A paper describes a structure:
Intrigued by the synergistic effect of SKI and asciminib on Abl activity, we structurally characterized this ternary complex by cocrystallization, resulting in a 2.86 Å crystal structure of Abl64–510-SKI-asciminib [inactive, DFGin, BLBplus (29, 30)]. Second, the α-C helix is adopting the “out” position resulting from this N-lobe twist, since an α-C helix “in position” would clash with strands β4 and β5. In consequence, the canonical salt bridge between K290 and E305, a hallmark of an active kinase, is broken in our structure, whereas D400 (DFG-motif) is positioned in the “in” position. We note, that the orthosteric site is fully occupied by SKI and the twisted N-lobe aids in forming this tightly packed binding pocket. When compared to other closed Abl structures, we find an extended domain interface between SH3, linker, and N-lobe of the kinase domain, which explains the positive cooperativity between SKI and asciminib. Moreover, S248 (located on the linker) forms a hydrogen bond with D96 in the SH3 domain, which is only present in the ternary complex of Abl64–510-SKI-asciminib. We conclude that our complex of Abl64–510-SKI-asciminib represents the only example of a fully closed and inactive Abl structure.
Double-drugging via active and allosteric sites is a recently developed approach to overcome these obstacles. Herein, we provide the quantitative framework for double-drugging using two targets: Aurora A kinase (AurA) and Abl. Both kinases participate in various cellular pathways, and their dysregulation results in a multitude of cancers, such as breast cancer and leukemia. We find that both orthosteric and allosteric ligands exhibit preferred binding to the active or inactive states and that cooperativity occurs by shifting this active–inactive conformational equilibrium through long-range allosteric networks that are encoded for natural regulation of those kinases.
Author numbering: 82 to 250, 260 to 270, 274 to 409, 421 to 460, 462 to 474, 476 to 526
Write the structure that this text describes.
């Protein structure tokens, strides 16, 4: 009804950004070039606001139980911390317009489809159809009516929506890491915590460091780290990226509390990384340094991938390479598929050192037959990483194929159930 409602809290602290509290009423006056920001007027003032942080009043997103387009296993992770009656309504990522209800009950997560009849009345069971989705959700929150339990408690959001650009349109240096290249720091103009990477050369050339970053600036995916800025005017070049509070994926995995980080969490991270790699491959970009250290962990196990196009740097890296990448200097997605298979072995092993096996002869060890089953790794997952390690690179599945497998691997089961 011409009005908008804020879905997430946003602190302004920006050029002309407007602070919004969840549930505030907004009148939208316009949008910026990319649409990631929109000018809004509220009872307090006028200013720019992230577009994904607010939704139209007539929108179905105004409801808490509607999480928009959500992966099936992402929804399963969302319901992992729930109780009986915990539920969410999601849009199918593979085919949009298809709606599903994910409902948690006694440790299980059940998925139901909201099918539309010839009348257009959406329904879950054929005996009760409704004109609108809100009617159906209200009815199934009143009685179960064919569901295993009533839709009682909408699931909370996993993370705030990702925005591209700190503004609609060198600086403070904090502590580095501790040791045992990348520093944490503050941007004053927007007063936000960022990560700054310094570098020397070899891969970081004179004109490549600027023309390559232009392609990197166009890297925009929820599971890919965002290149906020670059500073090439000083002998130490600065790479400004988002900040992830939990840091290294390998360090997280080795120190994590496995009761909180269970098999569903592991598949959530794997699906995130696979979707990031699918986005990178579909754009014809090669990561080249895929591994656990180059991934980062965020809130609610939000995983992002960094160090893409980095190739060199840090280095204080043999086992994550393709057999054809170090023998003949290959540049391909399939090498990244091999690195992804090693990464998934690491995830299945909770961060164990790969090939645990003489390094000085590992190449040969591969000319004939690869790591064995981790304890509890489902045979499907080992099969996937097995395909990811092929002597001929053409025989390895695409990252899109890997993601499609991952989503449909446990359609009639649970990864927690299929541990053994
Ligand atoms: O959950 C586990 N694996 C998993 C989860 C999700 C997967 O799918 C994906 F998609 F997420 Cl990769 C794939 C694998 C798991 C549980 N327990 C384990 N332990 C055995 C020794 C004991 O102390 C603890 C191990 C293990 C074996 C070797 N090291 N660790 C693994
Ligand atoms: C809490 O601990 C950490 C938090 C982090 N938060 C964000 N980023 C990190 N690492 C990073 C930063 C910039 C960078 O530069 C590039 C970015 C993309 C592509 C190429 C280069 C590479 C890695 C972090 C590292 C951390 O400890 C290892
Ligand atoms: Cl929306």
């Amino acid at each position: 009804g011409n009005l908008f409602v804020a879905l997430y809290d946003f602190v302004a602290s920006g050029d002309n950004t407007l602070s919004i509290t969840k549930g505030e009423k907004l009148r939208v006056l316009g949008y910026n070039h990319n649409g990631e920001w929109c000018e809004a007027q509220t009872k307090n003032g006028q200013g720019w606001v992230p577009s994904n942080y607010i939704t139209p009043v007539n929108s179905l997103e105004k409801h808490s139980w509607y999480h928009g387009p959500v992966s099936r296993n992402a929804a399963e992770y969302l319901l992992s911390s729930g109780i009986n009656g915990s539920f969410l309504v999601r849009e199918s990522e593979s085919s949009p317009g298809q709606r599903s209800i994910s409902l948690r009950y006694e440790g299980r997560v059940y998925h139901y489809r909201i099918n539309t009849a010839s009348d257009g009345k959406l329904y879950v069971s054929s005996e009760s159809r409704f004109n609108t989705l809100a009617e159906l959700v209200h009815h199934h929150s009143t009685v179960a009516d064919g569901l295993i339990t009533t839709l009682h408690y909408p699931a909370p959001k996993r993370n705030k929506p990702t925005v591209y650009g700190v503004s609609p349109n060198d600086i403070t240096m904090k502590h580095k890491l501790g040791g045992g290249e990348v520093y944490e720091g503050v941007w004053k103009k927007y007063s936000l915590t960022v990560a700054v990477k310094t570098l020397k050369e070899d891969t970081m050339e004179v004109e490549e460091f600027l023309k390559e970053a232009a392609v990197m600036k166009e890297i925009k995916h929820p599971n890919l780290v965002q290149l906020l800025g670059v500073c090439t005017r000083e002998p130490p070049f600065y790479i400004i990226t988002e900040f992830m509070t939990y840091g290294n994926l390998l360090d997280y995995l080795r120190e994590c509390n496995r009761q909180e980080v269970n098999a569903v969490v592991l598949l959530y991270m794997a699906t995130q990384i696979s979707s990031a790699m699918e986005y990178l491959e579909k754009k014809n970009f090669i990561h080249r340094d895929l591994a656990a250290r180059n991934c980062l962990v965020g809130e609610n196990h939000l995983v992002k991938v960094a160090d893409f196009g980095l190739s060199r740097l840090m280095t204080g890296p043999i086992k994550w390479t393709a057999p054809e990448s170090l023998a003949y200097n290959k540049f391909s997605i399939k090498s990244d598929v091999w690195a992804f298979g090693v990464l998934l072995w690491e995830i299945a092993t909770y961060g164990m050192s790969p090939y645990p096996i003489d390094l000085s002869q590992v190449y040969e060890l591969l000319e004939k037959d690869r790591m064995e089953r981790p304890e509890g790794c489902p045979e499907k997952v080992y099969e996937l990483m097995r395909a990811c390690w092929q002597w001929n690179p053409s025989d390895r599945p695409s990252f899109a194929e890997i993601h499609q497998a991952f989503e449909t691997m446990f359609q009639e089961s649970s990864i927690s159930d299929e541990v053994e």
